[PDB]
Ligand binder design. Structure first.
Ligand code: ATP
Ligand code: ATP
Lengths: 738, 242, 49
């Protein structure tokens, strides 16, 4: 509210914080000694957090050059020599955490128990010379003597770690909030120099967005990016998925839906990070369940190391299959046998049985690992789409499925059980659609249609092995497995498993695994993406060949039936043109493999009054069927190579001349030196927006602020009006104010 | 050098020097730069060929082993399909050089209840291995010729619409007659900047001036902030003062 | 990276590069946080003694 924002500006609140800062600076620096008053110190740090949080809330809808912003710097400059002690105290303890647990400090330990008596801290501090002379001696007072021999650094490090981080980050956000707003203030600039250590430490975690709303103007918003979230964003799997999304949106997608697709990709990426977090290993039925859970996550983590094993075995098995031989007389006219002929040590027959058993096990572990690594994402991507259709479209309330798509009909089975949002985060999707469509239509009809608990029994909260099979929902499991069994990736892995099982019946079935896998390694897919890009057109050309040759069969069958004598003498009844079916087979099988058309096998047309009537027949076969119709086949592969390249060239030339969030080109931002490069890495960024969604969902709905709650309200309404799309906070607040 | 020394042991080693040198004269490199541009992909296609023919060798070895009789009579034990290794060698050496696939050497498939089971075998060899897989090989050389040309076309269309030092396009400088041509030859120039580095290093560190010493300090710090990158002395000191 | 470790020990490292004072410049840039004599022996630079 603007009224209360200005009211506290024309007040004595600034005179109250300065007194609070003065006591706080000298209090913790004095309370830290003797370690006997940590509870008071911990409570003291708690009061510090609430002051800056209130200060941040005073800078929510601030203009670039506002009175409130200009007053806060006035408070800070007069509060000098006190906040610096606060920052210096934070810096001293933060550096210790990095120093402890490192190789340099681990070399100064003297006993297995772990301790440094009284002054080895100075020796440890001298190495990695960061702490000043006065600083290190202050820390010893801040620690305990412990009979001058038992200073435990493990507990000492974890004393003021969490309290320092929360206060330190909020100070950094507050300091950078003013700096980015008031550009011309020499007092503020020199004030930031002594606070550079705090800013330089919290740079990786300080986010920055440019949401627009609540004032019809662009507003910057700051937040915290966790270490784990940033680590998961740099995984090769995530980065590759990001590149695929950008490629799809630029070419396959288009405007008026780019923001809708981006948020959907943002939600999918968050769920992927959720799955990868719960499968990480680091950090009597009970024992069995623990082993099974760890074993299952072992397969999920090592899924791509198993696909490289199912291929290595298929290459090894097929290598020893090159020694097969057929003999009428078996070494160990019917009864033809197959046996190894290695002509060397017989260490290959046992190898085939050993490797065949191993391949089936590996090919079976992949389908289990896939069922617990990528299947949940498929279920999440399908539950989410159904949920957004019930509420914002009423697909099962007002409209009906088109009756020709199996997805609409099969999805009707799941909206009856009390487990519909099993993987989707939105647990209240049943009540939300009830409150959105339960008035126009039957309020109880929606309750029974969705299988939701009846309002009659909804009293608004008035108040072993056998036990397993009443906790399993029959309908939901049937629906879930129907989605899995129609998945393309699962079916391919299912086909891989059954063929390996079939390979024991006959050992030559293992050659099929050589084909479908070697194509998908790193680059054969791209080569295979030219043949199958024009796949619909490479088949119709063949269908055109089967028609042209038919029309040539009709003419050759009625007029040139004496020329097809495929015999020399006394064997005249060969004549592979006497009936339509054989002539078509002759003109199709050996009718196009020949280089000369059909004249390479038909007997020579000497002077028969039909020599000129057949030369035209022969020479048109060569042109229309061979020279031309086999040039279209080679003319479609070549164009495919030049179409996929141009598809990727456009993406590179479209992401380097636009902002992907605004519509402003790179020329406008380039007036400032390296402006566009800075604009796309700090102000507008895919990671920053993605990390915000992971931040809104993680944060409780009761802990939101003026800007976060406004965005969260729009996010649940699926109204992406908070993306700028027309401004960049430099065209509005700094076009003239700079 | 070692091959020339080896040429005295046998005089026919001097033919190897004919190959590696004649390619690098003035233009055979550019032609050779289309074959080797997609060098990583021209090998994988062959690796795909060595797999497709293996799968055809498996089928022909188990079901069509009577058709590979490469002899007329009284010489029946020729049968170049009886073992896997020889059938693979037969299907790989003379299995793709033929214009018709593998039906140009295998004996004629008359009515044997397998005539239709083999015609599909023969006619798929012609399409999948010869018509298509040898069109990718010719489809990679052709795309390489069109990729190196577009690579050089972009360079010409990027150095004639920008300053390579500032970011200002050629349209802004062209308000003055021949402005961009004059701007890239007098104010911003690769030679002038290059000749400055040859001037700072040659000049003694004690003979520098107010501007040269400032640049020299930045040059030793590897902070290239003295390049304009946003202005041209005509957008700042002469935008209104002309 | 591994093969280049053999050259930063002899008093001829900038034989062709113009910057002859590259041994002292790195010493004055990293000789405070790390061992001042450690850089002298690592680079083969003449000892401060
Ligand atoms: N938020 C953004 N807005 C606009 N363009 C962006 C944004 N993020 C990235 N880009 C574009 O991508 C370029 C670099 O980011 P990106 O990571 O997508 O590319 P990359 O360096 O090729 O990939 P990577 O870092 O995965 O190796 C930028 O120069 C810009 O062209
Ligand atoms: N400093 C520069 N800034 C911008 N463009 C430049 C600069 N120097 C050269 N160019 C570009 O190159 C063109 C001419 O210079 P350049 O020598 O590179 O080309 P060229 O005439 O084809 O070559 P050459 O003189 O070697 O025969 C200019 O018209 C301009 O497009």
């Amino acid at each position: 509210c603007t009224g209360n924002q200005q009211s506290l500006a024309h007040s004595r609140l600034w005179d109250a914080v300065v007194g609070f800062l003065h006591v706080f600076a000298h209090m913790m620096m004095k309370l830290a000694q003797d370690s006997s008053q940590i509870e008071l110190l911990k409570e003291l740090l708690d009061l510090q957090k609430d002051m800056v949080v209130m200060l941040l809330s005073l800078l929510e809808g601030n203009v670039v050059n506002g009175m409130i912003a200009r007053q806060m710097v006035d408070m800070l400059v007069e509060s000098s020599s006190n906040v610096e002690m606060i920052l210096k105290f934070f810096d001293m303890f933060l550096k210790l955490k990095d120093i402890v647990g490192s190789e340099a400090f681990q070399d100064y330990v003297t006993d297995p128990r772990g301790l440094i008596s009284k002054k080895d801290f100075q020796k440890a501090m001298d190495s990695q010379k960061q702490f000043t002379g006065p600083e290190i001696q202050f820390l010893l007072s801040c620690s305990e003597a412990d009979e001058n021999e038992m200073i435990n650094f493990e507990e000492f490090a974890n004393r003021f770690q969490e309290p320092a981080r929360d206060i330190g980050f909020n100070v950094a956000v507050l300091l950078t909030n003013l700096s980015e707003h008031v550009p011309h203030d020499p007092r503020l600039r020199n004030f930031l120099e002594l606070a550079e250590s705090i800013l330089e430490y919290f740079r990786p975690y300080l986010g920055r967005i440019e949401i627009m709303g609540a004032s019809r103007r662009i507003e910057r918003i700051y937040f915290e990016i966790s270490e784990t979230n940033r680590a998961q964003w740099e995984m090769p799997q995530v980065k590759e998925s990001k590149r695929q999304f950008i490629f799809d949106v630029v070419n396959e997608g288009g405007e008026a839906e780019k923001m809708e697709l981006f948020v959907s990709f943002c939600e999918d990426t968050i769920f992927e990070m959720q799955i990868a977090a719960q499968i990480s290993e680091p950090e009597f039925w009970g024992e069995l369940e623990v082993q099974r859970v760890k074993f299952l996550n072992y397969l999920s983590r090592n899924f791509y190391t198993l696909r490289f094993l199912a291929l290595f075995l298929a290459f090894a098995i097929n290598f020893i299959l090159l020694f097969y031989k057929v003999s009428d007389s078996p070494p160990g006219d019917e009864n033809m046998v197959y046996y190894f002929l290695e002509e060397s040590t017989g260490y290959m027959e046992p190898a085939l049985w050993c490797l065949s058993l191993l391949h089936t096990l590996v090919a079976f572990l992949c389908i289990i690992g896939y069922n617990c690594l990528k299947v949940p994402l498929v279920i999440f991507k399908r539950e989410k789409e159904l949920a957004r259709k019930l509420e914002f479209d009423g697909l099962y309330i007002t409209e009906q499925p088109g009756d020709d798509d199996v997805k609409g009909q099969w999805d009707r089975l799941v909206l009856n059980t009390p487990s519909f949002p099993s993987n989707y985060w939105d647990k209240f999707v049943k009540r939300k659609v009830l409150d959105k469509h339960g008035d126009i239509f039957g309020r109880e009809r929606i309750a029974e249609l969705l299988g939701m608990d009846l309002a009659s029994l909804e009293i608004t909260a008035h108040n072993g092995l056998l036990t397993w099979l009443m906790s399993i929902d029959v309908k939901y499991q049937i629906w879930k497995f129907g989605v899995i069994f129609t998945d393309n990736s699962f079916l391919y892995l299912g086909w891989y498993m059954v063929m390996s099982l079939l390979g024991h019946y006959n050992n030559f079935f293992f050659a099929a695994h050589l084909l479908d896998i070697a194509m998908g390694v790193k680059t054969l897919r791209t080569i295979l993406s030219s043949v199958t890009h024009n796949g619909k057109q490479l088949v119709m050309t063949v269908g055109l060949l089967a028609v042209v040759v038919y029309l040539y069969t009709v003419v050759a069958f009625n007029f040139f039936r004496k020329f097809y004598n495929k015999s020399e003498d006394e064997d005249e009844p060969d004549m592979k043109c006497d009936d339509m079916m054989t002539c078509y087979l002759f003109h199709m099988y050996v009718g196009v493999r020949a280089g000369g058309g059909i004249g390479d096998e038909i007997e020579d047309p000497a002077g028969d009054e039909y020599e000129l009537y057949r030369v035209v027949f022969d020479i048109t076969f060569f042109f229309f069927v061979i020279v031309i119709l086999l040039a279209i086949i080679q003319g479609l592969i070549i164009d495919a190579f030049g179409e996929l390249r141009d598809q990727q060239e456009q993406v590179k030339e479209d992401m380097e001349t636009k902002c992907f969030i605004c519509g402003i080109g790179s020329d406008y931002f380039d007036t400032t030196p390296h402006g566009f490069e800075t604009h796309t890495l700090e102000e507008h960024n895919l990671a920053n927006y993605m990390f915000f969604l992971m931040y809104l969902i993680n944060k409780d709905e009761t802990e939101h602020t003026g800007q976060e709650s406004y965005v969260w309200k729009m996010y649940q309404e699926r109204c992406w009006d908070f993306f700028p799309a027309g401004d960049c906070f430099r065209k509005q607040y700094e076009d003239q104010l700079s």
